[PDB]
């Protein structure tokens, strides 16, 4: 289990995103749910998986009562996705300076069907991340020493020895997919690179639903340089052959949506235009019928000159 | 399709709950999620499936802009449940007087796996409920003339002609079963009878997770006469042959948790499965049975009253 | 001086609106401003001229301290309009039960230019409305027996004997006209008829600026029958001889702006000045006429309903 | 067009106030109004002219949608005063770091009478301040290269190429006046110098109305030094000959109003007492009958030992 | 023990106020303080003695958890007063419907000095009020059949059988007198009659300190007929022989303080002690008498109405 | 009168607490009340004695109107305790930077019985702390040059020459006590030393009542070191001989109450166990019957491994 410091978050993201095409599979934004837990006295376990960063001044996180008599506190979380292989994750103890979780370990298990709610007592649990030490009010970026778990997993269990507080818990993993949305996160797609993110993130583009407001989308500052543009490179969770339609949803972007957009395709060198410059409108699902055969592995959305987009869909085989 | 007036809700349930063994398969509490919609100008589409009763003042409901160019507005909702057969539902237009939905019609569709977010266009959409008329600020309890739909669906589509507002949308259906939690709502269990429901319904007993607070559970009024007790009759999604674990969870109930609880089983005459046991607060109570019985309906008894969050029943057959 | 009961508001308007062509010349919405007052101990004098109806709970009104040493309390208000002849007004004592104004009397005055803030002392103050009696928590609609005052004024003074509270003070008067906006309230135009007023009155159509939000405009209920339309009949401050520009402004109406609008002219039989045109949201619609017509009353028609912020009509004569 | 930095605001105020006797003639505090504008999506154009300084955390200013297709956005503001000559002004882009207006130019025009609402299209518009560049989150103090415009103006137009945000817009100008209030701002009077201002400003003394609270008055910290005093030198908008009465209004100053006051007069060298030490009371209009003939150009109010005053009036010829 | 219905409150007071000369000796306003309690799970025990009437929504009252193992829940309250004899009180179960206190009983105890906080256990606790039954959301005005208790107490104990909620608990008793303030509540004075009580009762006149705001005083409605006056008849804790100072305190009454006040004395025919004097706001009015009179009941007269905070009367005997 | 700086607060506390066994006898937390005052215009005199530290952004303190004509402003405060000897105190002018009280002096007086409310005019007042200078926004720790006043006192009077603001006023004094609670503050007990205080203070343990929430108790951070503990040494206000029972109340500490506690006794050298390790529960009054004879002067409560306690009682002779 190698650790990373804020100083090298760049490298950490590289090991996680670019090299292992993984995502925070327990995040609520994508479907993650809290199945159970041992205690939740000062702050709810649900706080652990929210998309927003921890706020202060009540605590934004999971804090249990004091003096646990059990060897550890715990929580069981079900991935939003069908299953995935784990590479690493984050444990943020933000604003918990002292009463933070002293040590933490993670376990996983695979449950064929939604037969019921998993119990912490289940015999299928398996250690995914050996016990390690946490520091106060900080982020712990960690990767498994051997990398991607060779087994598939559906539920994960966080353990805090013996109790305390954790602000956020992120667990990155390679989605094991179930005509389909090739750029859908639940199908294995992930956001790779991007010009910039002001609010929201490029990985919001590959999510379920149209969202609730502009916060769950991808937005970029108001630029001024001529010929300026913004872009996001998504790696479809499965190389295409036939792309029927590409959808660019600007839902909730009413006064800051892009002026034009263009989509391109690349195969694991040259980029090919799939949807040339197209004037876009506010809060709409602009649908582009491609009906073309191409072997693309990556898609690139370009916002011009900048703006906000909620989602991008790429239906095909 | 028959409609029921408020003074007939008693019979309405009879049709959907006792007879058809249905439950609200699109509500959030259970996993219902908005996939998309044509517009949400004045009020968010997600409000539709909330578990709370509409609240006044912003509008606690769904509302599109005026003068729709298309023939109707729509919202696409994915079932929380794995699949279900439909019988009817509720369309509450609360607090929308005049600008309420003139007409509504419902369509269902069956999609195998989360390939992506279904589109209005999809040629699999079929009419499940013929277009009927809505009135100002009221509830519309309806049931399909032909009872349950022979087919089973995973997503439903609501159509409002041509635009306006709907406060709530409940769609009732019989869940299709995917050791298993035999009382778990996802496996087809439903609550038929209850002695009392002061706060939170009895159908909360059979849901995923442990919830957020006392509101997603079952709570009865405070009683005074000796020997008084409250109960909930639950129909297992399948008859049992063997039962290993029964779990009564009082999570979140700290000052009003029941004093003692018992669990009796029946085949449709009652047999004791769990003898009178003193319960505690915000705790999971695990009772080992290791016995074999052919019970179909279970009955939780809390004494003298109080609240319980969940009841699990692990068995076979 | 005659008074009208609520069940007579219908006739009240007839007298002031249709007959005398008056408008509330001291309200803030139109430019009314408090110049000074003798006291505002419990509630601000500025509340008097607000466009909203009194709201309960602080007191939404004007209230002076108890036991006034002088004979009466007073407030001096300057007309928004350039000058006007008075017919009557409203004195709403809403929510002031018992400590309401026992008596009230009104005085007017004509001051050329903004030399400074007029004083109570000024020897130009003349009685326009004889001292009458007010009752607890109610509205007092009154009209001068001698109709319009032969003279024209710029400031008015309200006297409360000897102290107490008044929720609202409306003073109706016929504006004195200073290419010109012939429908502009400052030039003497007034709205006589309207098919409907769900939110915001039709007299908002003829005001300065584009307003703040949807509240300072005209909005009609959402309609359902085909071919339904809503309208507003406006009397120009002067008959036209030539009309160059007509402008329909829907500023702030983004989801309920009208679909199409038309403008007909009449001389007091209607003539089309602006043919059916599709309108947009939060936009100014400029229609060139370059024609000559002797119209006195204009009529805006929005289809099928919705809201409009302003209507301008530039002409001659 | 010479610019000034916060470092030399002192000199800027000198060029504007002392040398050109000008005031912020479009300020709402004095009567400035927003007539129209091109867009107002993120923040209202009315925010531009409010008396208070820009606050943060919604934006306190004027921000338009993105990617304007028109060459520039704009707003038309009507001065509170009858007319004035312009010398300069301020453009604050506070808290707009990046999305601020890249460039700005100002235009003016004179409209004989309130014939209607001016259109940005009017042919009378005249460039008053050539296009210049703005920086992020900062104040831009600017003066016209040639100084006071030889022409009179009533409306001014701010243009933002092509869109963005401006926090505040101040436009200083010499008021062209219409027995009168010689110290009335609408008559050309201006606050020249002053010992100090804690809350509110000395220029609040020459405003219309009695105000709403202590914020629109002039207040000084609680001093302790013996024989300490505070003063404000106003320059009447017109040399006097006969001063009938001087009014000192302490409206809204109930616990921090001055203990004594004295008024003096000077002619453009020696100061002459007009109202000697006079014990003052709370929330009152202390009226001093002078009935004296004097050629004063400047008036000086002295607060002892300190305190709060709402307004000072000086009636005469 | 007799109970009185609301339509009998008139008689209730007669018994406790005029006859027995009692006052609410446990309310906070007067010094009542919670010493301890068995439980406060859903609602704080301190709410019981608040001077305000119960307010809805949290619960404005006292509420213990469900299923008490002991026979009853309890709260221990220490009298503000030095000691008192009990006659009866009020038990308001407002807003507690069903989960209200089934039964209640009261016990008193006399402890010399503040040795510590009394315990439920203490063998000095004696029954003062036999266990009676309470109903849902209502007031219970009761009086002891045997009138005043022969003994005097310092602390009282409320017992709720077995658990539930009580909104308010008033306990009436005749205070035991420890130059002295002869009208001071702690010396046994009580208010018998008043002409009017619009805001705040007359018994506030005789309390410790000057209070917090206008709410802890006596305020009468605004009157209109000439010569109208309001009064309060107060019974001194002892007859006077000599009276040196009378003090009328209008602290906090700034805009509704009385205009003039007078004070007459009587022996139980009235004699003037303080002649008509003009009163001021938020000020203490000290009137020297230096005379000897055998008065027992004093009478404060405010003209024409208004509010007064306190009335002190220093004398001998 | 020697002063102390924040730098030597440690020494100041030593002179006050350890050497003179004194406490803040006018604090509201212990019973202190405001009897009267000269003015309270900007901020209530009651703010002076609240237990919490001064907050900002209305002012948290006592601020009077400006320009007092009287030689000084003042306030009369009654100690919560029966009487005490004074050693020193604190005057905090927090957040009052400039308008703070320039000078201050303190007076005291003894009133046999609660005969009435003391007047600032009383002849018994005695100078306890000669007039001294205060600085802006700071704490003034001061001790009487000669120390403990040889006389007993019940009321104290703060004087501010001539007016301004004081944030807090603390007056430490040795309590003159009235089977009893030997560790009760009202009996002369005081908190001496302690391992640490996170929230609340160790001196909260010796207070009246059970409190309102966790803020009026003694709590320590969540520790992690093995064998870690927390303790508080109380000095009984009177050496014991027979200790009947010791009570440890953990009221309001539900999730952070200690796991075990032990009480010890010492005589003015060796510590003796009085209550050995005892598992403690939440929100309960753990009662320990000692029924032992011992000459202890000091008591020591030990929290293990840490936690929160509301009060400790020690009944005996």
Query: What is the 3-class SS of chain D, one letter each residue?
Result: CEEECHHHHHHHHHHHHHCCCCEECCCHHHCCEEEEECCCCCECHHHHHCCCCCCCCCCCCEECCCCCCCCCEEEEEECCCCCEEEEEEEEECCCCCCCECCEEEEEEECCCCCCCCCCCCCCCCEEEEEEEECCCCCEEEEECCCCCCCCCECEEEEEEECCCEECEEEEEEEECCCCEECCCHHHCCEEEEECCCCECCHHHCCCCCCCCCHHHCEECCCCCCCCCCEEEEEECCCCCCEEEEEEEECCCCCCCCCCEEEEEEECCCCCEEEEEEEECCCCCEEEEEEEEECCCCEEEEEEECCCEECEEEEEEC
Which of A66, A98, A102 is nearest residue F256 as measured by Cβ atoms?
A66
Same domain, B166 and B216: no
Q: Is D255 in Cβ contact with F42 (below 8 Å)?
A: yes
HEC states along chain A? CEEECHHHHHHHHHHHHHCCCCEECCCHHHCCEEEEECCCCCECHHHHHCCCCCCCCCCCCEECCCCCCCCCEEEEEECCCCCEEEEEEEEECCCCCCCECCEEEEEEECCCCCCCCCCCCCCCCEEEEEEEECCCCCEEEEECCCCCCCCCECEEEEEEECCCEECEEEEEEEECCCCEECCCHHHCCEEEEECCCCECCHHHCCCCCCCCCHHHCEECCCCCCCCCCEEEEEECCCCCCEEEEEEEECCCCCCCCCCEEEEEEECCCCCEEEEEEEECCCCCEEEEEEEEECCCCEEEEEEECCCEECEEEEEEC
Residues ≥6 apart with Cβ < 8 Å to B203: B23, B185, B190, B191
Chains F and C touch (3+ CB pairs under 8 A): no
**B186 token code pair:** 């996802």
Write phi, then psi, for D9 (nearest 5 degrees).
Answer: -55, -35
Peptide bond into C304 cis (omega under 30): yes
Confirm if C98 and C77 have CB atoms less than 8 A apart: no
Does A309 lie at the interface with D, CB-CB under 8 angstroms?
no
* Tally of structural domains, chain B: 2
Q: What would you report as the CA-atom Rg of chain E, rounded to the nearest whole angstrom?
A: 20
Same domain, F43 and F95: yes
Could you give the CA distance from residue D106 to residue D127 in angstroms, rounded to a whole number?
6
Residues ≥6 apart with Cβ < 8 Å to B69: none
CA–CA distances in Å: residue E195 to residues C283, E198, E218, E223: 63, 10, 11, 12
For residue A126, list its beta bridge partners.
A108
Same domain, B187 and B121: no
For residue B199, list its beta bridge partners.
B219
Q: What would you report as the CA-atom Rg of chain A, rounded to the nearest whole angstrom?
A: 20
* CB-based contacts of D2-11 (< 8 A; 24+ apart in sequence): D2/D142, D2/D143, D2/D145, D3/D132, D3/D140, D3/D141, D3/D142, D3/D143, D4/D141, D4/D142, D4/D143, D5/D141, D6/D139, D6/D141, D9/D141
Instruction: Look at the block and give the residue holding tokens 């326009």.
Output: C128
For residue F92, list its beta bridge partners.
F139, F168
Q: Which of E178, E197, E230 is the last residue of a domain?
A: E178
Residues ≥6 apart with Cβ < 8 Å to E112: none
Write phi, then psi, for D99 (nearest 5 degrees).
Answer: -90, 25
Write phi, then psi, for A30 (nearest 5 degrees).
Answer: -110, -5
Q: Which of residues 104-123 of F touch E (CB under 8 A)?
A: 113-117
* DSSP label of E214: G
Could you give the CA distance from residue E1 to residue D303 in angstroms, rounded to a whole number?
69
Which residues does chain E have within 8 Å of residue F69's beta carbon, measured at their own beta carbons?
A: none
Write phi, then psi, for F203 (nearest 5 degrees).
Answer: -75, 0
Q: Which residues of E289-300 are buried (b: 16+ CB within 10 A; e: fewer)?
A: beeebebebbbb
Does A150 lie at the interface with D, CB-CB under 8 angstroms?
no
Same domain, D129 and D204: no
Q: Is D180 in Cβ contact with C116 (below 8 Å)?
A: yes
Same domain, A213 and A125: no
Q: Is B255 in Cβ contact with E99 (below 8 Å)?
A: no
Which residues does chain D have within 8 Å of residue F65's beta carbon, measured at their own beta carbons?
A: 254-256
Q: Is B224 in Cβ contact with E66 (below 8 Å)?
A: no
Tell me which residue of B81, B86, B67, B99 sits closest to B20, measured CA to CA. Answer: B86
Same domain, B168 and B28: yes
In a 13 Å sphere around the CA of A264, the CA atoms on its Cβ side amount to 14
Distance from CA of E114 to the nearest CA of F (A): 7
Could you give the CA distance from residue D172 to residue F236 in angstroms, rounded to a whole number?
73
Could you give the CA distance from residue F116 to residue E313 in angstroms, rounded to a whole number?
9
Same domain, E36 and E83: yes
Q: Is E33 in Cβ contact with F115 (below 8 Å)?
A: no
Could you give the CA distance from residue A172 to residue A191 in angstroms, rounded to a whole number?
13
* Length, in residues, of chain C: 317
**B291 token code pair:** 């016995």
Write phi, then psi, for C43 (nearest 5 degrees).
Answer: -155, 130
**F32 token code pair:** 């202190």
Which of D35, D117, D184 is nearest residue C116 as measured by Cβ atoms?
D184
**B183 token code pair:** 């009382």
Could you give the CA distance from residue A157 to residue D262 in angstroms, rounded to a whole number?
79
Q: What would you report as the CA-atom Rg of chain B, rounded to the nearest whole angstrom?
A: 20
The SS3 assignment for E206 reads coil
Could you give the CA distance from residue C144 to residue A283 in angstroms, rounded to a whole number?
55
Which residues does chain A have within 8 Å of residue D133's beta carbon, measured at their own beta carbons?
A: none
Could you give the CA distance from residue B41 to residue A197 in angstroms, rounded to a whole number?
26
Instruction: Look at the block and give the residue holding tokens 């009654």.
Output: F78
The chains in contact with chain E, meaning 3 or more Cβ pairs closer than 8 Å, are B, C, F
Which residues does chain F have within 8 Å of residue A66's beta carbon, measured at their own beta carbons?
A: 222, 255-257, 259, 306-307
CATH code of the domain covering residue B134: 2.60.120.260
In a 13 Å sphere around the CA of E317, the CA atoms on its Cβ side amount to 16
Confirm if B76 and B153 have CB atoms less than 8 A apart: no
Same domain, B233 and B287: yes
Instruction: Look at the block and give the residue holding tokens 């062509």.
Output: C21
Tell me which residue of C225, C230, C240, C243 sits closest to C308, measured CA to CA. Answer: C230
Could you give the CA distance from residue C254 to residue C142 in angstroms, rounded to a whole number?
39
Which residues does chain D have within 8 Å of residue C284's beta carbon, measured at their own beta carbons?
A: 36
Distance from CA of B222 to the nearest CA of E (A): 6
Q: Is D305 in Cβ contact with F98 (below 8 Å)?
A: no
In the sheet that holds A230-235, the strands lie side by side as A190-194, A230-235, A298-304, A260-266, A272-279
Does F65 lie at the interface with D, CB-CB under 8 angstroms?
yes
Write phi, then psi, for B77 (nearest 5 degrees).
Answer: -120, 135
Same domain, A34 and A149: yes
Which residues does chain A have within 8 Å of residue B82's beta carbon, measured at their own beta carbons?
A: 114
Q: Which residues of F6-20 are buried (b: 16+ CB within 10 A; e: fewer)?
A: eeeeeebeebbbeeb
The SS3 assignment for E207 reads coil
Q: Which of residues 79-98 of D touch A (CB under 8 A)?
A: 98
Does A291 lie at the interface with F, CB-CB under 8 angstroms?
no
Confirm if C60 and C137 have CB atoms less than 8 A apart: no
CA–CA distances in Å: residue E117 to residues B88, E152, E288, F184, F242: 63, 19, 42, 9, 18
**B247 token code pair:** 């779990």
For testing contact with chain E, the best of C67, C97, C136 (most E CBs within 10 A): C67
Q: Which residues of F124-152 are buried (b: 16+ CB within 10 A; e: fewer)?
A: ebeebbeeeebebbbbbbbbbeeebbeee
Same domain, A233 and A96: no
Q: Which residues of A260-290 are buried (b: 16+ CB within 10 A; e: fewer)?
A: bbbbbbbeeeeeeebbeeeebebbebbebeb
Could you give the CA distance from residue E65 to residue E72 in angstroms, rounded to a whole number?
12
Q: How many helices (H) and strands (E) does chain E have?
A: 1, 23
Could you give the CA distance from residue C169 to residue E62 in angstroms, rounded to a whole number?
47
Distance from CA of E137 to the nearest CA of C (A): 25
Tell me which residue of D243, D244, D246, D248 sits closest to D286, measured CA to CA. Answer: D248
**E89 token code pair:** 């009180």
* Cα C3 → chain centroid: 19
Q: What is the greatest pairwise CA distance in chain F?
A: 64
Could you give the CA distance from residue F135 to residue A172 in angstroms, rounded to a whole number?
57
The chains in contact with chain A, meaning 3 or more Cβ pairs closer than 8 Å, are B, D, F
* DSSP label of B22: -
Same domain, D168 and D53: yes
For testing contact with chain F, the best of A67, A133, A163 (most F CBs within 10 A): A67
The SS3 assignment for B101 reads coil
Helix (H) or strand (E) holding C288: strand C284-291
Could you give the CA distance from residue E32 to residue E82 in angstroms, rounded to a whole number?
11
In the sheet that holds A139-143, the strands lie side by side as A2-4, A139-143, A84-92, A168-175, A23-24
CA–CA distances in Å: residue E46 to residues E90, F210, F216: 16, 10, 15
Confirm if C120 and C83 have CB atoms less than 8 A apart: no
Q: What is the greatest pairwise CA distance in chain D?
A: 64
Could you give the CA distance from residue F35 to residue F22 in angstroms, rounded to a whole number?
23
Give just the sign of the alpha carbon dihedral D306, D309, D311, D316: negative
Which residues does chain F have within 8 Å of residue E210's beta carbon, measured at their own beta carbons?
A: 34-37
Chains A and F touch (3+ CB pairs under 8 A): yes
For residue E171, list its beta bridge partners.
E89
Q: Which of D178, D209, D226 is the last residue of a domain?
A: D178
Q: Which residues of B268-298 are buried (b: 16+ CB within 10 A; e: fewer)?
A: eeeeebbeeeebeebbbbebebeeebebebb
Confirm if E43 and E125 have CB atoms less than 8 A apart: no
Write phi, then psi, for E271 (nearest 5 degrees).
Answer: -120, 135
Tell me which residue of B189, B150, B193, B207 sits closest to B22, measured CA to CA. Answer: B189
Q: How many CB atoms lie within 10 A of CB F224?
A: 14
Q: Which of D142, D158, D178 is the last residue of a domain?
A: D178
Peptide bond into B304 cis (omega under 30): yes
Q: Is F307 in Cβ contact with A65 (below 8 Å)?
A: no
Could you give the CA distance from residue B104 to residue B71 in angstroms, rounded to a whole number?
12
For testing contact with chain B, the best of E39, E59, E64, E66 (most B CBs within 10 A): E66
Helix (H) or strand (E) holding E14: helix E9-14
* Cα D31 → chain centroid: 10
Could you give the CA distance from residue E204 to residue E309 in angstroms, rounded to a whole number?
7
Q: How many CB atoms lie within 10 A of CB D130?
A: 11
Helix (H) or strand (E) holding B253: none
Could you give the CA distance from residue C269 to residue C277 in angstroms, rounded to a whole number?
21
Q: How many CB atoms lie within 10 A of CB F44?
A: 17
The chains in contact with chain C, meaning 3 or more Cβ pairs closer than 8 Å, are B, D, E
Could you give the CA distance from residue C180 to residue C312 in angstroms, rounded to a whole number?
9
Confirm if E296 and E235 have CB atoms less than 8 A apart: yes
Could you give the CA distance from residue E54 to residue E100 in angstroms, rounded to a whole number?
14
Q: Which of residues 194-253 of D touch F (CB under 8 A)?
A: 221-222, 224
Could you give the CA distance from residue E64 to residue E43 in angstroms, rounded to a whole number?
7
Same domain, A90 and A183: no
**Can you give the residue range of the structural domain that contains F119?**
2-178
Tell me which residue of E250, E238, E198, E234 sits closest to E219, measured CA to CA. Answer: E198
């Amino acid at each position: 289990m190698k650790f990373f410091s804020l100083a090298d978050e760049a490298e950490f993201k590289s090991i996680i995103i670019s090299k292992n095409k993984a995502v925070d599979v327990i995040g609520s934004k994508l479907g993650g749910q809290v199945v159970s837990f041992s205690d939740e006295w000062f702050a709810s376990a649900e706080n652990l998986i929210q998309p927003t960063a921890p706020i202060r001044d009540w605590y934004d996180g999971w804090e249990t009562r004091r003096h646990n008599e059990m060897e550890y506190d715990w929580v069981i979380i079900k991935m939003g996705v069908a299953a995935a292989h784990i590479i690493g994750g984050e444990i943020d103890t933000a604003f918990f300076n002292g009463n933070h979780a002293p040590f933490v370990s993670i376990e996983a298990l695979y449950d064929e069907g939604e037969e019921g709610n998993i119990v912490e007592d289940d015999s299928r649990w398996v250690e995914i991340v050996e016990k390690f030490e946490c520091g106060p009010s900080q982020r712990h970026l960690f990767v498994r020493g051997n990398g991607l778990t060779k087994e598939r997993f559906t539920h994960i269990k966080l353990k805090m020895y013996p109790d305390g507080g954790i602000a956020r818990f992120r667990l990155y993993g390679r989605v094991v997919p179930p005509i389909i949305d090739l750029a859908y996160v639940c199908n294995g797609a992930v956001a790779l690179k991007y010009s910039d993110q002001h609010f929201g993130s490029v990985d919001n583009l590959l999510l379920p639903g149209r969202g609730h407001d502009m916060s769950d989308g991808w937005e970029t500052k108001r630029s001024r340089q001529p010929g300026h543009t913004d872009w996001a490179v998504i790696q479809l969770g499965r190389e295409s052959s036939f792309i029927e339609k590409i959808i660019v949803d600007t839902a909730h972007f009413r006064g800051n949506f892009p002026q034009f957009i263009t989509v391109e395709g690349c195969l694991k060198g040259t980029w090919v235009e799939l949807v040339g410059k197209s004037k876009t409108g506010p809060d709409k699902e602009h649908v582009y019928e491609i009906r073309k055969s191409i072997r693309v592995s990556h898609v690139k959305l370009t916002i011009i000159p900048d703006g906000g987009v909620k989602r991008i869909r790429v239906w095909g085989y």
